[PDB]
C-alpha cells in the first residue's frame, strides 16, 4: 500500500518540484526536468480541463504519498467541516504525523520520515506512535526516542532542514531532537502551487 517506483519519474510527469529527494545533488542533474518519461514525453499536448484537475490532485497526493481512498476520506472530513474546505483539507494534510517530521526535518524526505514512524523510533507526548497517518493535535511534542537518536540519517536531515525554509507553526528544538506543534498553519503558510478551487471541484462533479 505504498508507492515504490521512481520518484523523479513522478516529478517529470507533474513537471514541478516535489522535493522527493534530499536536494544535495541538483535535481536537473538527475533527470530531464521538462520531459515527461518515456517515448512521447517531449511533445506537450493541448492538455484538457479534466487532465489539469487530475494532475493537480495527483500532485498533492504524490506530494504526501497518499493513496486515493484514504485521500478521499480527508475530502469527506474536510467537506464535513466548516469554512473553506481546501484550507480544512490542507490542515488535515498538515495534521499528518509523517508530514510534521519532515516539516521538522527529522527525516530528509517524507518517506525517510515515514520509515522512522514505521520503525517506531518516535515518541509523541512521550508515547510511541507507529501510525504514520496519525492526526497531530495542537500543543503536542514529537520526540525522537533514545534508541534511534544515534542514526546518522537523523542529524544529516537536520542540516537539510537548515537548507529549507523554517516553518512558522512549529516550535522545533535541536539539542533534544524534539518539536512542538504551535498551531495549525494557513494556506498562506504553505506553497501557492496548490489551488483550493480545483481539488474541491474535482471531487464535486
Amino acid at each position: 500500500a505504498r508507492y515504490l517506483g521512481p520518484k523523479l519519474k513522478l516529478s517529470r510527469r507533474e513537471g514541478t518540484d516535489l522535493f522527493l529527494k534530499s536536494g544535495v545533488r541538483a535535481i536537473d542533474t538527475k533527470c530531464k526536468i521538462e520531459q515527461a518519461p518515456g517515448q512521447h514525453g517531449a511533445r506537450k499536448p493541448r492538455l484538457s480541463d479534466y487532465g489539469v484537475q487530475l494532475r493537480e490532485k495527483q500532485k498533492v497526493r504524490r506530494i504526501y504519498g497518499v493513496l486515493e481512498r484514504q485521500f478521499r476520506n480527508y475530502y469527506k472530513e474536510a467537506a464535513r467541516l466548516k469554512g473553506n474546505t481546501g484550507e480544512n483539507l490542507l490542515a488535515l494534510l498538515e495534521g499528518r504525523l509523517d508530514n510534521v517530521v519532515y516539516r521538522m526535518g527529522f527525516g530528509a524526505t517524507r518517506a525517510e520520515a515515514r520509515q522512522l514512524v514505521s520503525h517506531k523510533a518516535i515518541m509523541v507526548n512521550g508515547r510511541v506512535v507507529n501510525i504514520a497517518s496519525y492526526q497531530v493535535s495542537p500543543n503536542d511534542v514529537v520526540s525522537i526516542r533514545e534508541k534511534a537518536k544515534k542514526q546518522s540519517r537523523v542529524k544529516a536531515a537536520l542540516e537539510l532542514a537548515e537548507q529549507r525554509e523554517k516553518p512558522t507553526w512549529l516550535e522545533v528544538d535541536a539539542g533534544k531532537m524534539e518539536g512542538t506543534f504551535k498551531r495549525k498553519p494557513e494556506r498562506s503558510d504553505l506553497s501557492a502551487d496548490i489551488n483550493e478551487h480545483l481539488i474541491v471541484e474535482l471531487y464535486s462533479k
Binding site: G83, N84, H197, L198, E201, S204
Partner: protein, 156 residues
Amino acid sequence: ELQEKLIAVNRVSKTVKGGRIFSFTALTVVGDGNGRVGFGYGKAREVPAAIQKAMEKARRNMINVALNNGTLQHPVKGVHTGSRVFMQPASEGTGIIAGGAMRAVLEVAGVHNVLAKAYGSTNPINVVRATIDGLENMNSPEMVAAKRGKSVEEIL
C-alpha cells in the same frame, strides 16, 4: 490582465456548386477577474485565425457586473433561446459549481464560490448568452436602496 478562455472549436460548412467550403468557428470569452466580462464568437478559414477575431470581438463590447466579495449576491436564472440556466451564490471555499461554458465564463468573471445549473439546451453559444443575461440584471443592494429610495439598513 484580462484573462482569456476559448470555449468552442468547431467546423461548419457552406455548400457551393463546387462542393463544401469548410469554415472553422470559435467561441471565446474574456474577463478581468473583476465584474467585467465579454464573450466573442469568431469565424474564419483557420483555427488559430478565427480565435483572434473571437478575442477581438470580446475585447470590445464588455459588460459591467455587480459582484459580491467572491460570489454572487442573490440566486437568479438565465435564459437565451431555450437555454434556461439557474445560478446561485455559495459559501466561501467551495469553488465554481458549473459545467460546460459556464465554468469558463464565471472564472473570468472573477467569482470564486457559486452554485449553477443549466436546464434545457446545453448549446454552448446560447448557454453562455443565458449566463450573461442573468449576471447582467443582477443588481446591488446599494442600487435597490437607491431604486426604492431607501438605505441598506432600511432593507437589510
